[PDB]
Symmetry: none
Subunit: 59 residues, 2 copies
């Protein structure tokens, strides 16, 4: 099951912010706020983790 487009774009943006070597506390605060704003955000966050992880294991 697919993630609505605009949620997918936010999910991507927040996952990438968190792959930086360093992350500010402000970015962290904003990420958490996005994840908590709507169950779809949190679901998309988690699914993206799983798939990013699976992709790394293949590559």
């Amino acid at each position: 099951t697919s993630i609505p487009g605009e949620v997918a774009e936010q999910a991507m943006h927040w996952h990438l912010e968190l792959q930086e070597p360093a992350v500010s506390a402000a970015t962290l605060a904003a990420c958490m706020s996005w994840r908590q704003a709507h169950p779809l955000h949190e679901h998309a966050w988690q699914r993206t983790q799983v798939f990013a992880q699976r992709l790394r294991e293949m590559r």
Copy 2:
């Protein structure tokens, strides 16, 4: 003000665990253990709190 990636992610996870309406005593002991395991964890925990609070005010 820079938190390394893997510490930022743990910080976020424990902060989110503590925003649940009910928290288990186990989760609590685990959160404490992380915060106490390394001064960077505790620093990340504090900064994150400062920024999550500033954020709630702006929403």
